[PDB]
Write a protein that binds this ligand. Structure first.
Ligand SMILES: CN(C)c1ncnc2nc[nH]c12
Ligand SMILES: [Ca+2]
Length: 430
C-alpha cells in the first residue's frame, strides 16, 4: 500500500491558553470574509506552498540537506473537519500572533492551528479562534516543524469533509502546485508549471504537451512565446498559436480567450475572459501573475500582453518571412477585426504593423508591410479582385508613386478604419 500520510494527533498543551483581542480591522474582516466558499482550499494550499518554498530556499542558501517538503490534506467525516499540513518554515509565536489564511473562516465554525518554526531550538504553539473577538495562543508539545491547520467546518459546509468533494476542488485549482500534495495519504498532483521554468530550459516536448492540455487540442503549436517579466507587473506566461487554421468556433467565440489565469501556480479563472484583447482570442496558453486579487483593474496587464504579442509577431515576420506569410493568411482576419474594433489610434497602428499587402513595385505574390512602404516613399492603396486586375484597373496607371493592393472588401474597410499610419494618411486610388 503506497499510502503516505503524516497527519496525526501528536500535539498537546500543558498549561492554559492566553486570550487576545483581534485588531479593529481584523474583527471586521473575519465577518466580511465569512460572507464561492471552496476557494479557501486554494488559499491554504498556496500558503503551504509558500511556506515550503521559504524553507527550501533557506536550506539551500545554508548548503544544508533538504527534509521532506510536502503538503498533506486530510478529511474526517465523523469529526466534520478538514486539515491541511505542510512541512515548511513554520511560524514563531510572534508571527503566529500577527498571522489568505482567514479565508478558512469562510467555512469554519472555529479554526485550530499548530505551528513550529524551522529555526533550531524552536517551540510549538497552538492557535485557536472561533472567528469572534478573541483568539487563544498556548505553547504546545509534539508540534512538527511547519504548520498544521484544522478547520472544524460549520454545518452549512460539511461537504468539505468529504474526500470526493475536496479531491474535485484540489484537482481543479491546485493541479500545478510545485510541491508534492497528498489527500488522505494519496498523491494528487503530477503536472509541471513549465511557465515558471527558465525559458531556454523548457523542451519542445514540454511545450507541445502543455499546449495540448491548455488548448485541449491534438496538433502542435506553430508559434511559442514564453514571456516572463517583473518590471510593470509580475508575469509568467506562455502563448501558443495553433498549427491548424482558425475554426468557425474560434472566429465566432464570444466571451472567451482560451487563456488560463494563474497566480503562484494556483488557478484563478479557467478561460479568463478579459486577459487578452478579443482579437487575440485565437491565442492559447496561460498567464501567471501574483498581482491578482483572487474584477475591474486588470486592463494594465491586457495592454502589456497585447504589445508583447504584437512585438512577438513583428519579430517572427523578420526571422521567417514565409512562416509568417501563412500565419497572416490563416489569422489575418483577427488582426483586421482588431483594428476595426479598436477605439484608440495608437492601438490601431500597432495592430496594422502586422498587416501585409501587395505593392505595385514588388512582383506578384510578394508581400510588404505598411512600414516598408513608408520607408520607400520619396499611403496610396487600391482594392481589386487580384493583382492582374489591379495593374489593369484605370485607377492604377494614373509619377513613380507605389500603391498597395488589397483584394478583400474587409481589407478596404480595415484600411478605412485605420485612417492613418505613422501620421501618413491612407488614401484610396479609386
Ligand atoms: C499562514 N501563514 C502566514 C504561514 N506562515 C508560515 N508558514 C506557513 N505554513 C502554512 N501557512 C503559513
Ligand atoms: Ca506539463
Amino acid at each position: 500500500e503506497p499510502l503516505h500520510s503524516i497527519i496525526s494527533s501528536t500535539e498537546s498543551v500543558q498549561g492554559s491558553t492566553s486570550k487576545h483581542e483581534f485588531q479593529a480591522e481584523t474583527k471586521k474582516l473575519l465577518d466580511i470574509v465569512a460572507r464561492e466558499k471552496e476557494v479557501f482550499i486554494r488559499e491554504l494550499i498556496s500558503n503551504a506552498s509558500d511556506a515550503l518554498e521559504k524553507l527550501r530556499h533557506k536550506l539551500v542558501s545554508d548548503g544544508q540537506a533538504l527534509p521532506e517538503m510536502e503538503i498533506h490534506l486530510q478529511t474526517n467525516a465523523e469529526k466534520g473537519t478538514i486539515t491541511i499540513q505542510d512541512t515548511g518554515i513554520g511560524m514563531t509565536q510572534e508571527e503566529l500572533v500577527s498571522n489568505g489564511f482567514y479565508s478558512a473562516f469562510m467555512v469554519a465554525d472555529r479554526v485550530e492551528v499548530y505551528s513550529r518554526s524551522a529555526a533550531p531550538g524552536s517551540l510549538g504553539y497552538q492557535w485557536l479562534s472561533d472567528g469572534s473577538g478573541v483568539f487563544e495562543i498556548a505553547e504546545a508539545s509534539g508540534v512538527r516543524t511547519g504548520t498544521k491547520i484544522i478547520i472544524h467546518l460549520k454545518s452549512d459546509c460539511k461537504e468539505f469533509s468529504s474526500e470526493a468533494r475536496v479531491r474535485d476542488v484540489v484537482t481543479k485549482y491546485s493541479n500545478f502546485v510545485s510541491f508534492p500534495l497528498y489527500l488522505n495519504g494519496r498523491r494528487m498532483n503530477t503536472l509541471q508549471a513549465i511557465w515558471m521554468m527558465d525559458p531556454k530550459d523548457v523542451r519542445e516536448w514540454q511545450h507541445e504537451e502543455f499546449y495540448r492540455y491548455v488548448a485541449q487540442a491534438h496538433d502542435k503549436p506553430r508559434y511559442t512565446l514564453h514571456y516572463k517579466t517583473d518590471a510593470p507587473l509580475n508575469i509568467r506566461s506562455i502563448f501558443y498559436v495553433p498549427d491548424m487554421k482558425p475554426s468557425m468556433f474560434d472566429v465566432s467565440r464570444e466571451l472567451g480567450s482560451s487563456v488560463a489565469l494563474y497566480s503562484r501556480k494556483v488557478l484563478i479563472q479557467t478561460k479568463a475572459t478579459d486577459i487578452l484583447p478579443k482579437w487575440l482570442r485565437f491565442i492559447r496558453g496561460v498567464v501567471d501573475s501574483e498581482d491578482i486579487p483572487l474584477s475591474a483593474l486588470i486592463r494594465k496587464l491586457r495592454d502589456v500582453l497585447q504589445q508583447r504579442l504584437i512585438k512577438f509577431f513583428i519579430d517572427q515576420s523578420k526571422k521567417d518571412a514565409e512562416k509568417y506569410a501563412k500565419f497572416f493568411e490563416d489569422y489575418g482576419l483577427f488582426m483586421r477585426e482588431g483594428i476595426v474594433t479598436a477605439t484608440e489610434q495608437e492601438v490601431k497602428e500597432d495592430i496594422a504593423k502586422l498587416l501585409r499587402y501587395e505593392s505595385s513595385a514588388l512582383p506578384s505574390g510578394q508581400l510588404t508591410s505598411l512600414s516598408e512602404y513608408a520607408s520607400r516613399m520619396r499611403i496610396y492603396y487600391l482594392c481589386a479582385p487580384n493583382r492582374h486586375l489591379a495593374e489593369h484597373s484605370p485607377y492604377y496607371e494614373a509619377k513613380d508613386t507605389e500603391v498597395l493592393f488589397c483584394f478583400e472588401q474587409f481589407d478596404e474597410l480595415t484600411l478605412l478604419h485605420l485612417r492613418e499610419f505613422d501620421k501618413k494618411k491612407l488614401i484610396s486610388v479609386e
